[PDB]
Amino acid sequence: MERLVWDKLTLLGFLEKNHIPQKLYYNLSSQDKELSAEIQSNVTYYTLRDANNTLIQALIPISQDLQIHIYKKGEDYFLDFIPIIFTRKEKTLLLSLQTSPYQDIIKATNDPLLANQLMNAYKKSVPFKRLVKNDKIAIVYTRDYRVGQAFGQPTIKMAMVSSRSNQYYLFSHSNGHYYDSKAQEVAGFLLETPVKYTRISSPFSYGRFHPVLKVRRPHYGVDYAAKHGSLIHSASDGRVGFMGVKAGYGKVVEIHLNELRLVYAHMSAFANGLKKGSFVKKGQIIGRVGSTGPHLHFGVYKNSRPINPLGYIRTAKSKLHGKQREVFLEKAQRSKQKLEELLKTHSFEKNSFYLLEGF
Ligand SMILES: [Zn+2]
């Protein structure tokens, strides 16, 4: 296949460019239309053409784990939503700073997304502006590969940053939140429900891809059933990055807050004065619920990846308890011992970074 980057196109633009009847999109269920509206610019996608230059296959990412597969059989085009095929590798970075964190992490890994994720995750506990030469940074993380090419975002499993005689740890959890050495949440956020709802008509789901009888489509936000006219509130502070129509979402507002993007779709109207560029405060009215039943699709992206918004709708951060805490801390202990060992057996006099396989 040709490997290409997406840039300006929408799904309907891509179909027209390639003489694929647009009914391939319009016949989709509304849920599939919603999935189709999150083709991000800058994503690597893949195409196969015949000796007449006719589009025979395209694989276009919707998320890190799901893609649109367009393909031609005989005279007909088909469109499925299917798993992205990939390999997952775990790495451990041991770094002694020589200049600047962002810059040195990139020099050691070629992975600016990793650098930026770490900076954001620590921004309220160790500002990177604070770090100096010979401070230490460790990161255990996974990276995904398709046919030898890295794609998507890394995921941090653990990190340790040392500054001013202290070590500051970050540990992932299966619940999606990150925690410090005390099993207290770090680098999260507090969201408000964006609409007064009757029920959640469709919850968030990562989907299920095997075995065949268990297969379930992902849904990368929360669909709220709400009475016609309901006002929509921003779940957070932020800045409006998009306001308008996107096929599959109808009228939609997107708000950016640091590494977050919040999506508010199927609206009837935007709030007077609101435009691209506006700053908004948590709870501020941004528009009104539409049927473009009446529903709001609320999406939350963290480091460009959809996450279950309901885990963040709360008035205080997460802190583990009970057996969850016992198990978390025992795992954290063993992680800490292993990192200490790796740091023993890896002198920074020889090399100012090491990039190791596994952990
Ligand atoms: Zn939805």
Residue numbers in the entry: 41 to 332, 337 to 403
Reproduce text from the manuscript describing this model.
Among these, only the N-terminally 41-residue truncated Csd3 (Csd3Δ41) comprised of residues 42–403 was expressed in soluble form, and it yielded two different forms (the orthorhombic form 1 and the hexagonal form 2) of well diffracting crystals. The form 1 crystal contains two monomers (chains A and B) of Csd3Δ41 in the asymmetric unit. Chains A and B are related by non­crystallographic twofold symmetry. However, they show larger structural deviations from the chain of the form 2 crystal, with r.m.s. deviations of 1.61 and 1.85 Å for 353 Cα atoms in chains A and B, respectively. In the form 1 crystal, the two monomers in the asymmetric unit bury a relatively large surface area of 1130 Å2 per monomer (6.0% of the monomer surface area), whereas the largest buried surface area in the form 2 crystal is 710 Å2 per monomer (3.8% of the monomer surface area). Loop I of Csd3 shows the most significant deviation among the homologues. In form 1 crystals, it is involved in crystal-packing interactions by forming sulfate-mediated salt bridges. However, it is flipped about 104° towards the solvent in the form 1 crystals.
Seven cell shape-determining genes (csd1, csd2, csd3/hdpA, ccmA, csd4, csd5 and csd6) have been identified in H. pylori. Among them, Csd3 (also known as HdpA) is a bifunctional enzyme. Its d,d-endopeptidase activity cleaves the d-Ala4-mDAP3 peptide bond between cross-linked muramyl tetrapeptides and pentapeptides.
